[PDB]
Amino acid sequence: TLKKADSAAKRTRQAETRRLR
Amino acid sequence: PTIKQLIRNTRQPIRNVTKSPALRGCPQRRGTCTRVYTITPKKPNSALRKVARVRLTSGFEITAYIPGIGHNLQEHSVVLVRGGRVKDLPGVRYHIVRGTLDAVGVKDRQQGRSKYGVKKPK
Amino acid sequence: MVKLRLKRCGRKQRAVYRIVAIDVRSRREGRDLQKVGFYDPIKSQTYLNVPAILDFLEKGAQPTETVYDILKRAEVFKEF
Amino acid sequence: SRYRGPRFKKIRRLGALPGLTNKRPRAGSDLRNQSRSGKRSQYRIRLEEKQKLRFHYGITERQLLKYVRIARKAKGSTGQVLLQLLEMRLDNILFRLGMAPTIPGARQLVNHRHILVNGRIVDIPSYRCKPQDTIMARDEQKSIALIQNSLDLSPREELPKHLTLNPFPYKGLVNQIIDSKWVGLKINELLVVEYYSRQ
Amino acid sequence: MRSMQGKVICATNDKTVNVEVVRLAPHPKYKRRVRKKKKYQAHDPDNQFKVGDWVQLDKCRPISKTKTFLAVAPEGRQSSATRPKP
RNA sequence: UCUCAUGGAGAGUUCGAUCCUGGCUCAGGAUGAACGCUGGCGGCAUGCUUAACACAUGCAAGUCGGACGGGAAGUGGUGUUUCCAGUGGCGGACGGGUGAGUAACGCGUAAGAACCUGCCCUUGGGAGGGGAACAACAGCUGGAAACGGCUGCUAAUACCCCGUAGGCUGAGAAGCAAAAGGAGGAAUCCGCCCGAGGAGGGGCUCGCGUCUGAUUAGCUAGUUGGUGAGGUAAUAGCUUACCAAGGCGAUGAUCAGUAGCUGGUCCGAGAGGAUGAUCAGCCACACUGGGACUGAGACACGGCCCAGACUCCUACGGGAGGCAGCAGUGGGGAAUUUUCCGCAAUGGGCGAAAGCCUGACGGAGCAAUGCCGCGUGGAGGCAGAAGGCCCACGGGUCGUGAACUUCUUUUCCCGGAGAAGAAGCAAUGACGGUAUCCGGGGAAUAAGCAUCGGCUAACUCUGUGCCAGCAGCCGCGGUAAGACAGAGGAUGCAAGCGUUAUCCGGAAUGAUUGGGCGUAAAGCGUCUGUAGGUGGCUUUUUAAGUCCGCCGUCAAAUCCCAGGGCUCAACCCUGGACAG
Ligand SMILES: [Mg+2]
Ligand SMILES: [Mg+2]
Ligand SMILES: [Mg+2]
Ligand SMILES: [Mg+2]
Ligand SMILES: [Mg+2]
Ligand SMILES: [Mg+2]
Ligand SMILES: [Mg+2]
Ligand SMILES: [Mg+2]
Ligand SMILES: [Mg+2]
Ligand SMILES: [Mg+2]
Ligand SMILES: [Mg+2]
Ligand SMILES: [Mg+2]
Ligand SMILES: [Mg+2]
Ligand SMILES: [Mg+2]
Ligand SMILES: [Mg+2]
Ligand SMILES: [Mg+2]
Ligand SMILES: [Mg+2]
Ligand SMILES: [Mg+2]
Ligand SMILES: [Mg+2]
Ligand SMILES: [Mg+2]
Ligand SMILES: [Mg+2]
Ligand SMILES: [Mg+2]
Ligand SMILES: [Mg+2]
Ligand SMILES: [Mg+2]
Ligand SMILES: [Mg+2]
Ligand SMILES: [Mg+2]
Ligand SMILES: [Mg+2]
Ligand SMILES: [Mg+2]
Ligand SMILES: [Mg+2]
Ligand SMILES: [Mg+2]
Ligand SMILES: [Mg+2]
Ligand SMILES: [Mg+2]
Ligand SMILES: [Mg+2]
Ligand SMILES: [Mg+2]
Ligand SMILES: [Mg+2]
Ligand SMILES: [Mg+2]
Ligand SMILES: [Mg+2]
Ligand SMILES: [Mg+2]
Ligand SMILES: [Mg+2]
Ligand SMILES: [Mg+2]
Ligand SMILES: [Mg+2]
Ligand SMILES: [Mg+2]
Ligand SMILES: [Mg+2]
Ligand SMILES: [Mg+2]
Ligand SMILES: [Mg+2]
Ligand SMILES: [Mg+2]
Ligand SMILES: [Mg+2]
Ligand SMILES: [Mg+2]
Ligand SMILES: [Mg+2]
Ligand SMILES: [Mg+2]
Ligand SMILES: [Mg+2]
Ligand SMILES: [Mg+2]
Ligand SMILES: [Mg+2]
Ligand SMILES: [Mg+2]
Ligand SMILES: [Mg+2]
Ligand SMILES: [Mg+2]
Ligand SMILES: [Mg+2]
Ligand SMILES: [Mg+2]
Ligand SMILES: [Mg+2]
Ligand SMILES: [Mg+2]
Ligand SMILES: [Mg+2]
Ligand SMILES: [Mg+2]
Ligand SMILES: [Mg+2]
Ligand SMILES: [Mg+2]
Ligand SMILES: [Mg+2]
Ligand SMILES: [Mg+2]
Ligand SMILES: [Mg+2]
Ligand SMILES: [Mg+2]
Ligand SMILES: [Mg+2]
Ligand SMILES: [Mg+2]
Ligand SMILES: [Mg+2]
Ligand SMILES: [Mg+2]
Ligand SMILES: [Mg+2]
Ligand SMILES: [Mg+2]
Ligand SMILES: [Mg+2]
Ligand SMILES: [Mg+2]
Ligand SMILES: [Mg+2]
Ligand SMILES: [Mg+2]
Ligand SMILES: [Mg+2]
Ligand SMILES: [Mg+2]
Ligand SMILES: [Mg+2]
Ligand SMILES: [Mg+2]
Ligand SMILES: [Mg+2]
């Protein structure tokens, strides 16, 4: 498996976690 | 006249009215002939003039003059019309560009050929 | 930040640059604060007005490589 | 973009045009039909004046027009400045230096890269000549031969005081800017300026 | 810049006044001068000013959805005080 | 007769004639133009104005292994070195496109005070002692796929706690708050936390300027202000409760209609009119509406959520998507280009650097769309011949024109060499073996298009007979048409020439400069009078207009002047300035 969307995805997840903090 | 009166906006221009409303700010428009027929000119010019009615893309219906000598146009033909007025015929404000789309060029015209849409003879 | 760089003027194939103090986020030819140097490869024409250069290097303007080395040749980094 | 048509013909209708033809016109032989247009409308007088100018220098209209704009701009007497500008053309200077038979000749001479202005080849007719300028032939056999034969076999020594010619290498030199009295034709620039009020 | 002098049309409200300022302008086309009159909500703490007053008008931060201007004592004006007659 | 001026043209048409008022029409410029005919080259530009209508395919934002745990390629193995999803770090808020909405502090200008600020400078101090998790991975498992679910497991520049703090709250007393390591053998480097500055980038507030409509006259109740509590990075009806009754409006509020705005562009003798493509600044928008989250910065074009409309995939249970990014397809249309090359230059992003990515950009291709340059030959050529056309048959004219003789080779053809653009270590060029330069042939490869009645430069003849047709306006055409069609001839422009559309001019025809109202269009039927405008003389005051000097600014580009560079010009570059 190989995933390419760094900008979108990674930033979206980060947004969740930081949001909960 | 009185300064105080001009300062109330007493000078207003008359705007420029177009001679060819049907074109709507275009060099030409394309249309389909609804009818092709002859009309008699206002006296004292007697003749039989070749006019078609054209329904345009801009939705209008107009009456366009057809120039030159003789023509092949018949109903449900697709032509190209341009502006300019035939002082003879009441209401006729548009010509039909010859040599384009469905109007062929005038046959056997040797002089001022570009006005009628004719090739140069070899 | 403020950057001292080249903006590209002149014509197709014949290129001539101005050296300008401008915020880094404006476009390459966009608006600027001050015009400073003049540069050109083909005429080998180069020169700068140093008072401005120094007044901007002082307030923390960062140059771009090409420009950096232009100021080097003209000895503006020594005075600094 | 050049007038390749019959020359004598334009000459019959305009007047005397040096930069065109050295052959004096035929007796004119119009004395049979005795056809005239009556006289000339003031407009036609003006028009023929401009045409005089235009064909003497082998300039196109759209060009002449831009000369005239340059003229109205310039600070000075308009007709005079115009005549200056037209008379400073490289081919025309090449002509009035006797380095050419006529202006189409001189023009051809320039086109084919046979001429030098200050040690550099200029092949375009309309190059404007400025004071202190060197007009040379290219050093090749052909260039020299052309210039020599057309210079020597034409006797005219009328050189108009702003133009120097020097003998063996054939260095021509442009000395200064033309004087209104030294101009290359009989023309009232007044008429031409007037014709051009509408552009 | 230069502050705007005017006269008070309304004192009724609290800590405020409504000033009218009259200025002359050279109308863009016709070159004659014209009186244009504009009204302002001026902030006046202490409510010292009454109706009819001639007051100078000053600029400060927003006090409200309207009042940006501080009401200020008449700046310089020709004394309506009688003067000698030599 | 010094100084200034470099600028203002008319013509036809009402009448049997005239003079006038008055319209229509023409001659000139300009296009993001289109169409017709014709088309050799180069230089610099330009290229969906209509449907902000739909979009098949491919590409347009990533980078860091020197934050970190892993596994996968090899190698003989952790000596070498690579890739890789994942957590973290900054960047995806710039750059690119469009002009739908917006008559507004949105834009231009000029002010202000209550703010914010990652990166970049400048500076003052610091970085103790612990602990807990979560992906990855592992195992089990659900799905056609898309994507999931359980249980374990683990590192950190990722989370949490405690100590200390020139800061924050507070009249005070007091109370409260921080950290992160990675490189290197060490020196040292890049970082980290807290203050305090700088510059730049944003947020707000206000004066002024910022379309048409009165056959749109009243509009507004958180509306206009006051207090108390909240809220915002900050001031504020920003919010909310109470109190008060204001605010705006005939100098046009509200409502309706149109429109992105400005440097500018086009036109004008000027005064000013019309417009807002390319180029540059600002605003607004991202399938149609609404939310927030993250973050220095977004209410976020190639992010999230929801609703809706539409397209696709599906093994039917469910998923996927947003070209008004570069190309490209359909469609609308009179009309607007290649599913191109390259990161070499400049500019960006990340990185210690090496470097990687950039449909920004740099270039090519297509198109006479426009502006500028050049060519299609130069010189001589019995005054004799063929032929067209006219002719009172004498001759005229196409016409020195061609044929013909010589010279020249820009352009064309065939060979050679061949750049600058690349920046100080060399190397590194998409353009391109292009621009340019040397040789060899050879007049050799290259002229059309309008008009010829007046305005308007240019005239005759044959064919037609109120017909066929022309025309911008007057008007031409019923047997000899200078107005139709053909011929010959001439005239104008020229690789373009015409026709149509659009705008300004001429138009003094909406008139400030610059008109009129006894009879031509035009004085309310007459007064009284409110707002509004103008208003006698003399002295003084003030200094708002007014005037003069000095300063700040009105971005660069454009226009104007003076030089310089592409062989010239267009175009580019430097310097400077009147206006206002
Ligand atoms: Mg007009
Ligand atoms: Mg160099
Ligand atoms: Mg040309
Ligand atoms: Mg001809
Ligand atoms: Mg050349
Ligand atoms: Mg004019
Ligand atoms: Mg009458
Ligand atoms: Mg009559
Ligand atoms: Mg009149
Ligand atoms: Mg015209
Ligand atoms: Mg063609
Ligand atoms: Mg569009
Ligand atoms: Mg696709
Ligand atoms: Mg790619
Ligand atoms: Mg590595
Ligand atoms: Mg790497
Ligand atoms: Mg690091
Ligand atoms: Mg190792
Ligand atoms: Mg990786
Ligand atoms: Mg953006
Ligand atoms: Mg942008
Ligand atoms: Mg663009
Ligand atoms: Mg403002
Ligand atoms: Mg604003
Ligand atoms: Mg306003
Ligand atoms: Mg940050
Ligand atoms: Mg610690
Ligand atoms: Mg603590
Ligand atoms: Mg190491
Ligand atoms: Mg170490
Ligand atoms: Mg406007
Ligand atoms: Mg309330
Ligand atoms: Mg709109
Ligand atoms: Mg005028
Ligand atoms: Mg566009
Ligand atoms: Mg733009
Ligand atoms: Mg769409
Ligand atoms: Mg936040
Ligand atoms: Mg937005
Ligand atoms: Mg984005
Ligand atoms: Mg997109
Ligand atoms: Mg596209
Ligand atoms: Mg199509
Ligand atoms: Mg179509
Ligand atoms: Mg590519
Ligand atoms: Mg690059
Ligand atoms: Mg770079
Ligand atoms: Mg960097
Ligand atoms: Mg490009
Ligand atoms: Mg071509
Ligand atoms: Mg071209
Ligand atoms: Mg071409
Ligand atoms: Mg064309
Ligand atoms: Mg086109
Ligand atoms: Mg000849
Ligand atoms: Mg040769
Ligand atoms: Mg090098
Ligand atoms: Mg050669
Ligand atoms: Mg005539
Ligand atoms: Mg005709
Ligand atoms: Mg016309
Ligand atoms: Mg008759
Ligand atoms: Mg007969
Ligand atoms: Mg006849
Ligand atoms: Mg006869
Ligand atoms: Mg005829
Ligand atoms: Mg003919
Ligand atoms: Mg006018
Ligand atoms: Mg008047
Ligand atoms: Mg009148
Ligand atoms: Mg009457
Ligand atoms: Mg009357
Ligand atoms: Mg009366
Ligand atoms: Mg009455
Ligand atoms: Mg009265
Ligand atoms: Mg009164
Ligand atoms: Mg008074
Ligand atoms: Mg008085
Ligand atoms: Mg400027
Ligand atoms: Mg100059
Ligand atoms: Mg030059
Ligand atoms: Mg300049
Ligand atoms: Mg000024």
For the CA of D44 and the C1' of F455, the distance in angstroms is 14
D131: helix, strand or coil: coil
Q: Domain range holding C72?
A: 1-80
The residue in chain E having the minimum alpha-carbon distance to the alpha carbon of residue B8 is: E30
For the CA of C68 and the C1' of F68, the distance in angstroms is 36
Q: Report in angstroms the alpha-carbon separations of B90 from B49, B51, B93.
A: 12, 12, 9
Tokens of E58: 């000053």
> Given 3-state DSSP classes, what are the helix, strand and coil percentages for chain C, each rounded to the nearest 5?
30, 40, 35
Residues of E in Cβ contact (< 8 Å) with B6: 30
Tokens of B55: 């329904």
CA D186, distance to chain mean position in Å, is 12
The residue in chain E having the minimum alpha-carbon distance to the alpha carbon of residue B3 is: E30
Chosen for mutation from E24, E29, E33 (greatest number of chain B CBs closer than 10 Å) is E29
Q: Which domains does chain D have, with CATH numbers?
A: 1-86+184-199 (1.10.1050.10), 87-183 (3.10.290.10)
Find where tokens 């080097």 sit: C72
Helix (H) or strand (E) holding D148: helix D141-152
Name residue E70's beta-bridge partners: E43, E58
Q: D5 CA to middle of ligand 4, Å? A: 8
Q: Any idea of the CA torsion for B98, B102, B107, B110, to the nearest 10 degrees?
A: 30
How many domains does the structure of chain B reveal?
Answer: 1
Within 8 A by CB and 6+ apart from A4, the residues are none
What resolution in angstrom units was achieved for this structure?
3.6
Residues of B in Cβ contact (< 8 Å) with E32: 3, 7
Whole-number Å distance between alpha carbons of C69 and C51: 18
Domain positions in chain E are 1-86
Residues of B in Cβ contact (< 8 Å) with E36: none
Min Cα–Cα distance to chain B from E9, Å: 26
Within 8 A by CB and 6+ apart from E70, the residues are E42, E43, E44, E57, E58, E59, E60
Min Cα–Cα distance to chain E from B14, Å: 19
Whole-number Å distance between alpha carbons of B96 and B54: 10
User: How many CB atoms neighbour CB D164 within 10 A?
Assistant: 13
Residues of B in Cβ contact (< 8 Å) with E30: 3, 6-7
> Which pairs count as long-range contacts for E47-52, CB under 8 Å and 24+ apart, including other chains?
E47/E11, E47/E14, E47/E15, E49/E8, E49/E11, E49/E17, E50/E8, E50/E11, E51/E8, E51/E9, E51/E10, E51/E11, E52/E7, E52/E8
DSSP A1-21: -----IIIIIHHHHHHHHHH-
CATH at B68: 2.40.50.140
Q: State whether E27 and B3 contact (CB < 8 Å).
A: no
Nearest nucleotide to B21, CA against C1' atoms = F501
Q: Domain range holding B86?
A: 1-122
Whole-number Å distance between alpha carbons of D81 and D71: 6
Conformation bin of residue C6: beta by default, left when phi > 0, alpha when psi is -120 to 50: beta
Q: Minimal CA–CA distance to C42: which of C15, C60, C66, C63?
A: C15
Q: Minimal CA–CA distance to C4: which of B88, E17, C74?
A: C74
Q: Report in angstroms the alpha-carbon separations of E8 from C15, D62, D101, D148.
A: 64, 69, 92, 98
Q: Is the peptide bond before B44 cis (omega within 30 degrees of 0)?
A: yes
User: How many CB atoms neighbour CB D32 within 10 A?
Assistant: 6
CATH at C9: 3.30.1320.10
Q: Minimal CA–CA distance to B119: which of B95, B93, B90, B98?
A: B98
The residue in chain B having the minimum alpha-carbon distance to the alpha carbon of residue E27 is: B7
Within 8 A by CB and 6+ apart from E50, the residues are E8, E11
Whole-number Å distance between alpha carbons of D37 and E35: 68
Whole-number Å distance between alpha carbons of B18 and B37: 27
For the CA of B9 and the C1' of F223, the distance in angstroms is 34
Q: D36 CA to middle of ligand 66, Å? A: 21
For the CA of C12 and the C1' of F44, the distance in angstroms is 9
How many domains does the structure of chain C reveal?
Answer: 1
